[PDB]
Amino acid sequence: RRRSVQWCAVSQPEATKCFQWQRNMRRVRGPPVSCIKRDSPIQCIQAIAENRADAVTLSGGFIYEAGLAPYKLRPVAAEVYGTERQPRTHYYAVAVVKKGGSFQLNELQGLKSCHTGLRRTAGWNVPIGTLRPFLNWTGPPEPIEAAVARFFSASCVPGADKGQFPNLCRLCAGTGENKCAFSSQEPYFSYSGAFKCLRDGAGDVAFIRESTVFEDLSDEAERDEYELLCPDNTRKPVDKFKDCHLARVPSHAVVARSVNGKEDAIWNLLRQAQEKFGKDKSPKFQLFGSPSGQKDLLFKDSAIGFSRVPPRIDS
Ligand SMILES: [Fe+3]
């Protein structure tokens, strides 16, 4: 009757990490963590709601959905970014382009775009929300995806309906059924996939977060080959994100059942994993690190930890 916290992995790579997370947790004598493999965030959201798993980290994009019936999941902990000396539970949504180009934010029409994924914050909600006016979209019933698949010549918005909006998956590098998948099986998936999409030359603009270029480039010189599109219709060097970003957004978060959620145990698991497996904590396992050729598995790579979401009873 050992009922540990059961984590929901989306895709094989994530599964694998969870399992590694598990043996190391056992190794160091911390609370145990078990692993359930799902295929999509939604598949996870469901499992959790039906007691087949207890937790999963979601992008600020899905948090709202997950909280509605019949799901009713509620965030228990938020990811923490920044550095130890300065930590934050927010990040910046920016648009990165190659330096050398003329176009400004208001001149994206007809260009090729790279997004982290459908419904995520920096990769979709913010940019699209901002480009709204230029989209000439005649509200619902017509899907915003429709309006966007006609504003950019081609894109890669992992998770998008390939059959309806084939334009939105045109640039995606996934093989077969994984092309445009909202999973690590799709190489242009997530911040780094989106940025890779720009670096590989598939798109002209990448909607990602402020640290990507910093996290991704082995040579600091190479950062110079890129720049940011600011909202005043100017371009600034990559480190100017504090003065050139589309929005400041809250961090990704761990969600759980509003009822019988095991919040206390989840929290305990996290607090311990972070102490043992956080940044530069162990040569054996990094909770916030992903293998070569995968990224942001389970948690945001290079995040620094978690912050407990205040107490709730009314929910
Ligand atoms: Fe995000």
UniProtKB/Swiss-Prot annotation:
Disulfide bonds join 8-44, 18-35, 114-197, 156-172, 169-180, 230-244. Keywords: Antibiotic, Antimicrobial, Cytoplasm, Disulfide bond, DNA-binding, Glycoprotein, Heparin-binding, Hydrolase, Immunity, Ion transport, Iron, Iron transport, Isopeptide bond, Metal-binding, Nucleus, Osteogenesis, Protease, Repeat, Secreted, Serine protease, Signal, Transcription, Transcription regulation, Transport, Ubl conjugation. The keyword tRNA processing does not apply. Changing residue 72 to A: Almost no protease activity. Changing residue 209 to G/E: Destabilizes iron binding slightly. Residues 26-31 are annotated as: Involved in glycosaminoglycan binding. High levels are found in saliva and tears, intermediate levels in serum and plasma, and low levels in urine. In kidney, detected in the distal collecting tubules in the medulla but not in the cortical region or in blood vessels. Detected in peripheral blood neutrophils (at protein level). Isoform 1 and isoform DeltaLf are expressed in breast, prostate, spleen, pancreas, kidney, small intestine, lung, skeletal muscle, uterus, thymus and fetal liver. Isoform 1 is expressed in brain, testis and peripheral blood leukocytes; isoform DeltaLf is barely detectable in these tissues. Residues 1-2 are annotated as: Important for full bactericidal and antifungal activities. Residues 19-29 are annotated as: Interaction with lipopolysaccharide. GO terms for biological process: antibacterial humoral response; antifungal humoral response; antimicrobial humoral immune response mediated by antimicrobial peptide; bone morphogenesis; defense response to Gram-negative bacterium; humoral immune response; innate immune response in mucosa; iron ion transport. Fe(3+) 1 binds at residues 59, 91, 191, 252. It comes from the Eukaryota. The active site is at residues 72, 258. Monomer. Found in a complex with LTF, CLU, EPPIN and SEMG1. Found in a complex with MPO and LTF; interacts directly with CP, allows Fe(3+) incorporation into LTF and activation of CP ferroxidase activity. Belongs to the transferrin family. This is Lactotransferrin. The gene is LTF.
